[PDB]
Each structure stands twice: as C-alpha cells, then as structure tokens.
Amino acid sequence: MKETPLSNCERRFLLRAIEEKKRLDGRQTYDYRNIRISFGTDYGCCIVELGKTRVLGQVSCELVSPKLNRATEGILFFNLELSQMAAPAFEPGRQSDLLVKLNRLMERCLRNSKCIDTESLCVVAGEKVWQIRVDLHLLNHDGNIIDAASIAAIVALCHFRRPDVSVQGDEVTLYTPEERDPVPLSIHHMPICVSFAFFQQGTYLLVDPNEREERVMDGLLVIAMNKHREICTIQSSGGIMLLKDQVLRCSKIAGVKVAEITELILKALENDQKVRKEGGKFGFAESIANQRITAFKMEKAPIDTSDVEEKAEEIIAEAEPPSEVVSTPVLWTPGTAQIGEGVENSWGDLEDS
Amino acid sequence: CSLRHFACEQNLLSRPDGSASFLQGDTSVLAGVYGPAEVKVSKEIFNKATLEVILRPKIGLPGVAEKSRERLIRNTCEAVVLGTLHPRTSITVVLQVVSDAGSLLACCLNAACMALVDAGVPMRALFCGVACALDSDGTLVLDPTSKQEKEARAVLTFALDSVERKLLMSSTKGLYSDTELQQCLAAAQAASQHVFRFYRESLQRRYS
Amino acid sequence: GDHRRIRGPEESQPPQLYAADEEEAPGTRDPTRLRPVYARAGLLSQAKGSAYLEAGGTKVLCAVSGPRQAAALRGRLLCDFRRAPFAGRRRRAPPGGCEERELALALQEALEPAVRLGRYPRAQLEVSALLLEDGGSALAAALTAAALALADAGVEMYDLVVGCGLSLAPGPAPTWLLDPTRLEEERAAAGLTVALMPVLNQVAGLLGSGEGGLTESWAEAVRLGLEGCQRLYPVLQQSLVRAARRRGAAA
Amino acid sequence: GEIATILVENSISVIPFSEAQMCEMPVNTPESPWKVSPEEEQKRKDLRKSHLVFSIDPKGCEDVNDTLSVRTLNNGNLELGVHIADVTHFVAPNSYIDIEARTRATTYYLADRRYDMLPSVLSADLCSLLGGVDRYAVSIM
Amino acid sequence: TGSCAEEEFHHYGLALDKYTHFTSPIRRYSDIVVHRLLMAAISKDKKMEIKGNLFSNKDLEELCRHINNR
C-alpha cells in the first residue's frame, strides 16, 4: 500500500497562506511546536513528543574487547529505525534512501562533535572496555523526524547511568546497584539539530514544518550547533539553491532555538532528578492523564484462588486411563528396526530381476 | 495470587486507524492497526483477508525467537476475526516493546486485542492473556515478575476466549506434570474474569 | 552473525588440524576397474521426478520439479547444487560457497545439451541435487542422478548424460586412474571429469585442471573417460526400465 | 581540589552507601521511633533510676563514647564503673554493615569535618548519649 | 595472643602488661571484635554454647595487619 495523494486545492491554499505569512496550526514563523518529555523507570529511556511526533530512545552498555588499535577508548554504535506503524509508507526494506541520510546526519552530529567522553570508558587496555549502544525508534510520523530524534538521543544519553567496577592490582570485580551505586556519564556539550524549509524558490522560510508543509516545499536546510556559539554540522539538501546572507540568518536562528531547547532540556532533567530523589513515584504508569476519557486505572485484585485444587482433582479422576495394547518392535538386521503394522516379507529381494 | 496495577490508553497516535497502549505494572507494549486496505496481488486471497503481525524489540534486532512468537500472535488473532466479510484486503498488526518487566506475551496479547477493538474490526469474541509461574515447590503465582521468573522452575502463558473461557494459545517454559497444568489452567480461567471486567469498564468509560 | 539461524560460537577450529594421527598411505590398485553401482529411480513421492545414486562411498539425492510459470520460444533450465554439511572432513557454512556455484554452473552447462527446451515456451524447469556423503568423485554423480531424474519426470530429451572421473598419480611415472576415492583424490595432482552421450556419441561437458602438461596424456584421460561412460550405460539402462515397469503397473 | 587529593591519595572512600546497604536500618521514624522491647528489659538490668550517669565531652561531640559513674553504697565504700556503648545489635555477622566496617577500619578525621565509619544517622542519633533517652550500653562494675 | 609468647604481650610505654581499647566500638574496628568477644565471655560462663563461630588465627592476624596499615 501507499499513502494518500495530495490534491490541487490544498497546495493552492497552503501557498496562499505562506504568501500571507499565516500557518495552519496558528504558530508564527519562528516557532516550535511545544515539547513534552517522559522518563521510564530504569535509566536511559525516554519518550519525547514534538507536536504529534513520537520517538523512543533507549541507551544500553556492554563490556567487550577493544578491537586492534585505539586501545584506550570505547566504541559507540547507533541505529535509527523507522517503525512500519509510524506511517503507511514505511515498509521494512522499501524506504532505503531516507534511512541513510538520517543515520548519517545523526552519526556525524553526535560522533564528530566530540561531546561524549569516550576517553574515560576503559578498565584495562587491550582488555575489556565498555561498548555503549544508542537505539532510537520512530513511532508516529508528523514531520521533522530529526529534531525529535536528536532531542531524544540527547536526553537518553544525559539520563543513562553505567554499572561500576573496582580495579586494583591486576584483578577485576563487577558490582550491582545494591553492592555499588550506578555512575553517571561525562557530557561536554549539547549538540541540537535545527531544520529550515524553503518555499517557492527561497523567497520565504518556515521554522519547524509539519507533514503537509513538508510536501509543499522545495528543499530543506539543517544546521546542527551545540550550546555557546559553536556550529557542529550543516547539510543543505532537497531541491534548494541558496544565497549567502541566508545561511548566516539561518545560523542565527538555530543559535536562538538551540539556546531555548537546551534551557527546556536542562529544566526537565532537573525536575526528574528532584522527583527521583524526594522519594515519590515515577515511571511510565504515573504519567497517564487521569482527566481524560481514554484512560482507566485498576489496583491489584486477588481473584479467588480458592477452587483450583478441587476442579483439577475431579478432572484428573474423571477421564479414561491409558489403554494397554502394547506394540512390538521387529528386528531386521542390526541397524534397522520397525514398529507398526509391519511389512509382509523380511525384505525385498529380486523383486523385479 | 493477585494481578498487579493495570492501565491503558486509547487513540494516542493520529496517523494509524486505531492505537492502544497497555501497560500492566512496569512492563508496557504499544500497538497500532491500519484498517482494511489494499494488498499486494501476489499475497491476496479470495473470500478471506490476510493478517500480518510483526514484533519489534527494544534492544537489538528481531531474530528466530521474535518470529516464532509472531506466528502465535497471528494464529491467535486469526481465530477471532471475521475475515470472510472483507476479502481481497489486508489487516496488519504491529507491536512495539517499550519496557520489559516480566510476562510480556500476555501484555502483548492484551495490547493487540485493545488495538483491534479500537480500530473497529469485526470480531467474533475477545481474547485475553494470563501468565502463570509456579515456584520450585508448587506455590502458584499469577502475573509474575522477572525476579520471580528467574527463580521459578516453570512459566506458562495462556490465551483465553471471552465466551466460554476456552484455550486458544499455549506456550510453556520449564518441565512439570499435568496436575499443576490443570490447576494453573483453572487459575487462568479465574483470572480472565477480571480482565474482561477491565475491558468492559474501559469501553463504558470511553463512550461516556 | 546471522539473524535467520541459531547462533553458537563465533569461531570453531575442528580437531583435524589438531589430529595427532599422521596421514596414512592410500595403497595401490588396478586402474581398469569401476566401483559397483546401485541406482534407484522414482524415490520421492511429493516430487515429479527423483532418483538416488549410490556407488561405494558416494550418496547423492536428486529431485526434479515440474514446469512452472515464467530465448522465449524456449524455456529456462534452473539448477541448484548443495551438499549436506555433515559431508567430508570438515563442516561447511550453510549459506553457500563459490565451489557450489561452480558445480551448479558445471551442471547447467552440461544438462542443457540434452533436453529440448523448444517444447516448453515461457515455462521453466528446476533441478535440485543434494550430496549426502562425499566419498569420491562427486561431479560424476550429480550428472548421472540429475539426468536420471529428468528422464523419470516425463520431460522430453534427446538422450541421457553419463559422467565419469579420473585422477593423476603423484609418482615419478604418473598414470591416470578411473573412479578415484578421497584416499586417491587428495594425494593426486590433477583430475578430469567427462560427460558423454552414449548413443549420439557427443561430449556434453569437460572440466580438468592440474599439473599434467603434455598433450598426450589428456588424450588418454579423455578416451578412457569415454570408455567409462560407455561402460556405465547398461545399469542406467535397466534402472529406468524397472522404474517405468513399476510405475505403470501401479495404475 | 586539595582535600579531594588528600582523600584519593591516602586511600579513603567518600561514597555514600547503596540501597540494600542502607535499607537494613533501624527505623527511627516519627510515627514509630525506637523503644526497647520488654523481654530485653527483663533480660538486661536497668539502672536508669538508682544511679547517676553523665559525661564531659569535647566541643562539638555529636557522638559520645565515654561515660562513668561512682557512688557510695549502704556500707561506705566507693564503687567504680565505666560504661561504654554496646553497639553490637545493629551489626549482625556476615552483614553488609559488617563487611563495610571491616573495610573502613578506622574513622578518619581531617580538621574541618569527621567521616562516620558507619552510615550517618545509625550512630549520629541512635548511639550517642544525648538528651536522656534510652540507650543500650555495657556497664562494667 | 597465643600466636606469640607472653613476653610479647606487654604495654611497657604505660608500665602495664596488657592494654587495648574497648571505649570505641564506633570509630574503629578492633573494638567491635572486643565487643563480640566480651559479650561471648559474659554469655559463655553459663555452661552453654555460642552458636556462630568467631574468628581464627590467620583471620585475626590479617585483620590486625590491615588495621595497622589503615
């Protein structure tokens, strides 16, 4: 199956809007759709919602032997993924020219910026070191997959907490959250992606576009830039043909937006740590809105486990015992034996000769 | 024996036809369904529809185990969906594992059932998921946790009808005798009576 | 590693490379002898045509599927060669191998000169061969069996295909041998396999590589291969006769 | 930074404990604080009425060890006794607090703060002779 | 103790012949040893048995070397 086609009335209406500098959902040009984060119970797991998009991030680490060369660092996998349920079009092996540009954007940003400290993830050299592995999934496609994926990866990496080890002399030991407290990571900076869309041959631009606005646009400009004033990647793409003042304007815009987004992320992580430290209840369950028609909650229930013995006993007692015709095995010659109705002759011989 | 905290939310995502997140305690599973749509000519069947079930884990990539547990989920939904009313079309079920804390298959079956119900698919009868885990001595525990699952000598999971409480699907781990298989089946039959009440109360609240 | 199979150890060195028993001595024989062969046709019940060929230490099973949908004006002849992992000194990777593709092409370029594809427009035939045990010349068995299977599957052919095999001794006075075994094949310098049509007297396939460089030994290797393919024919003559006598009388 | 260097170098730990190493705690909660189960009042021999116990202690002594008491009896002689806190009831053998104590052999003192060998409320309310609340001890006599 | 001779038991600097601490079970480690042992002593002169073992020679000597280090 494919996705519904685009009519010729919506295109005209969207372009009349864009000309008039008014958007569908009311938000003006330099705005984001507001954000809403939610944390799991075990560390390094979050659900970010930008507008109506969803991404699931989950970090996980493991101890391996560090290849050959680079004997004093650790490796860092990544794996974006697009879930068949995100949108009709996504198909497990039929959208192979978006996955590549997305994985590349994500990896170049996160791994070339050098914000994670992969220096201090060794135990010995030439021997076991930690191998982290980020994982993202797209749940609901409504445009701007990469801003949400980047914020998700950031939060998931800034909420993880490793295991921890004791090393002295030439001897290892591995603890557990009851034997020793999990340990945080070291994060230099916060690289946060921003996207721009261009409309009718660069004459207008719109920040943070959604999926209809994504189908009425010429090309896209992405500018990934960590906090302070330091750019980390740019990738023009789509169908665009650019000037030189516009890249600078865009860089300013991305500066502002990454400032605001980092503000938000820091505040949310702080609130989450405060909640976890007070001693209250946390998790995916205690996030479900209760003021809403589509939610229902039920505490525990002993059902009545008073009768199962009797029923099982009568059932076992009330049925026919195994019968008693026992079969015999036949021996032809050591190596082959037969059981069943058998064959008339011992074996065939000169049947046709 | 006591089932733990239950919660459910419906119509989360705007793109699919019906969505339903079902979390029972700490573990959670999200599901969505696309209604009867077009199907590839090489896979279509006349006088019937075609059910497609794919399962995605949270860490790693699916292997032999996830397809072996995908057959069970597809062959369980195939026995309660009236496909003859919709031939030459396709019905697809997608399951995403968000968090794991024990008894994942039962929560997946309940997520699939609530997604099919929300999506508006003709159904013959509802189905449930109940998991039993008897300990090293014989003390039955219902809806266990991976802490108890690790210590337990046998774990059993059942899918039960909503009409006469028959047995639809059965996947068992560990070795046991038939007597406690009967007593855990009876415990499952006693447990489904509360899940179906949770179903009815949730849909009664939805249409308030 | 593989996401469609059961994963075990990443690496596994077989104990032959640690086998402390030194390689033995093959022995000697008469180079004018053939290993006795027993052939059976029509084995499988769910297959359109099948045959099982066994001679000495070689066990090969071949089955032929019927024409299916999809040089047209002519039908294709797909081929597939695959040998059981529990065959030979060491294990083999299930996914495949370049040697298997080489033998598959040596089969396709040898069974097409026999069948007449100008009678199956827009159709195709599929031939599958499996080697249960490798105890000698293999390509001399994947040809005889895959030719018996085709004739037993009711497809129209000009003639059969009968294969043979040879190997070269490593001594100071080398001599070609007929029907070599693994004890006479791993100690050899070169090997040759011929595919002769016994009635049309036309060579269908030829393959040979090694250390024999004089263009007077290969003439003998070829013509004793032709004598072997002219000596294997009667057994295959009575095998299809028995196969049709039994198949027809069952109605 | 200098204090941290002195710690790391001289082999002293500054890590607060974990959940299961903490949780095995005496519950000094306001809704139910600590008070002696009467069979142990039988089994012991109270002196909170018939004898006087006090202590001089250094400035800042949030945690007292030393106590004594000398009175006269119905004859005229001077009974002597030194009373040391009996902290053995909250460290069970092969525990986590006992392995912990076995590791941190000696409480370390640098001249701003202390560093409790134990968790920081097990003795710094429950073991220190303060106030005039009940407190298990050992009185040689 | 009896791992060594009597002559090696004295407290010459204080003119005693045996001297340890018992006034600090909280800020040290030999004192919890002394607590367990002193209570074993007050508990043993009744003709019963103190279930649960206490120590051994090598254990005590490695502990005392550890405490010297610390």
From Swiss-Prot, chain A:
GO terms for biological process: exonucleolytic trimming to generate mature 3'-end of 5.8S rRNA from tricistronic rRNA transcript (SSU-rRNA, 5.8S rRNA, LSU-rRNA); immune response; mRNA catabolic process; nuclear mRNA surveillance; nuclear polyadenylation-dependent rRNA catabolic process; nuclear-transcribed mRNA catabolic process; positive regulation of cell growth; positive regulation of transcription by RNA polymerase II. The keyword Ubl conjugation applies. The modification Phosphoserine is found at S65, S306, S346. Keywords: Acetylation, Cytoplasm, Disease variant, Exosome, Isopeptide bond, Neurodegeneration, Nucleus, Phosphoprotein, RNA-binding, rRNA processing, Ubl conjugation. Transmembrane segments: none annotated. It is found in: Cytoplasm; Nucleus; Nucleus, Nucleolus; Nucleus, Nucleoplasm. The modification N6-acetyllysine is found at K297. GO terms for cellular component: cytoplasm; cytoplasmic exosome (RNase complex); cytosol; exosome (RNase complex); extracellular exosome; nuclear chromosome; nuclear exosome (RNase complex); nucleolar exosome (RNase complex). There is a cross-link at K297 (Glycyl lysine isopeptide (Lys-Gly) (interchain with G-Cter in SUMO1)). Residues 1-268 are annotated as: ARE binding. One of its GO terms (molecular function) is mRNA 3'-UTR AU-rich region binding. The keyword Ubl conjugation applies. It is linked to Pontocerebellar hypoplasia 1D: An autosomal recessive neurologic disorder with onset at birth or in infancy, and characterized by progressive axonal motor neuronopathy, severe generalized hypotonia, respiratory insufficiency, and cerebellar atrophy. Death in childhood may occur. This is Exosome complex component RRP45. It comes from Homo sapiens. The gene is EXOSC9. The chain holds residues 1 to 353 of 439 of the full protein.
Swiss-Prot record, chain B:
It is found in: Nucleus, Nucleolus; Cytoplasm; Nucleus. InterPro entries: ExoRNase_PH_dom1 (IPR001247), ExoRNase_PH_dom2 (IPR015847), ExoRNase_PH_dom2_sf (IPR036345), PNPase/RNase_PH_dom_sf (IPR027408), Ribosomal_Su5_D2-typ_SF (IPR020568), RNase_PH (IPR050080). It holds the Pfam family RNase_PH_C. GO terms for biological process: defense response to virus; DNA deamination; mRNA catabolic process; nuclear mRNA surveillance; poly(A)-dependent snoRNA 3'-end processing; RNA catabolic process; RNA processing; rRNA catabolic process. The keyword Phosphoprotein applies. Highly expressed in a variety of hematopoietic and epithelial tumor cell lines, but not in normal hematopoietic tissues or other normal tissue, with the exception of testis. Keywords: Cytoplasm, Disease variant, DNA-binding, Exosome, Intellectual disability, Nucleus, Phosphoprotein, rRNA processing. GO terms for molecular function: 3'-5'-RNA exonuclease activity; DNA binding; RNA binding. Its main location: nucleus. One of its GO terms (cellular component) is nucleoplasm. Homodimer. Component of the RNA exosome core complex (Exo-9), composed of EXOSC1, EXOSC2, EXOSC3, EXOSC4, EXOSC5, EXOSC6, EXOSC7, EXOSC8 and EXOSC9; within the complex interacts with EXOSC3, EXOSC8, and EXOSC9. The catalytically inactive RNA exosome core complex (Exo-9) associates with the catalytic subunit EXOSC10/RRP6. Exo-9 may associate with DIS3 to form the nucleolar exosome complex, or DIS3L to form the cytoplasmic exosome complex. The gene is EXOSC5.
UniProtKB/Swiss-Prot annotation, chain C:
SUPFAM superfamilies: Ribonuclease PH domain 2-like, Ribosomal protein S5 domain 2-like. GO terms for cellular component: cytoplasmic exosome (RNase complex); cytosol; exosome (RNase complex); nuclear exosome (RNase complex); nucleolar exosome (RNase complex); nucleolus; nucleoplasm; nucleus. Pfam families: RNase_PH. It comes from the Eukaryota. One of its GO terms (biological process) is nuclear mRNA surveillance. Keywords: Cytoplasm, Exosome, Nucleus, RNA-binding, rRNA processing. The keyword Calcium does not apply. The keyword Nucleus applies. Residues 1-34 are annotated as: Disordered. GO terms for molecular function: RNA binding. It is found in: Cytoplasm; Nucleus, Nucleolus; Nucleus. Belongs to the RNase PH family. Non-catalytic component of the RNA exosome complex which has 3'->5' exoribonuclease activity and participates in a multitude of cellular RNA processing and degradation events. In the nucleus, the RNA exosome complex is involved in proper maturation of stable RNA species such as rRNA, snRNA and snoRNA, in the elimination of RNA processing by-products and non-coding 'pervasive' transcripts, such as antisense RNA species and promoter-upstream transcripts (PROMPTs), and of mRNAs with processing defects, thereby limiting or excluding their export to the cytoplasm. PANTHER family: EXOSOME COMPLEX COMPONENT, EXOSOME COMPLEX COMPONENT MTR3. This is Exosome complex component MTR3. It comes from Homo sapiens (Human). The lineage of its organism: Eukaryota, Metazoa, Chordata, Craniata, Vertebrata.
Swiss-Prot record, chain D:
It is found in: Cytoplasm. Belongs to the RNR ribonuclease family. Component of the RNA exosome complex. The catalytically inactive RNA exosome core (Exo-9) complex is believed to associate with catalytic subunits EXOSC10, and DIS3 or DIS3L in cytoplasmic- and nuclear-specific RNA exosome complex forms. Catalytic component of the RNA exosome complex which has 3'->5' exoribonuclease activity and participates in a multitude of cellular RNA processing and degradation events. In the cytoplasm, the RNA exosome complex is involved in general mRNA turnover and specifically degrades inherently unstable mRNAs containing AU-rich elements (AREs) within their 3' untranslated regions, and in RNA surveillance pathways, preventing translation of aberrant mRNAs. It seems to be involved in degradation of histone mRNA. This is DIS3-like exonuclease 1.
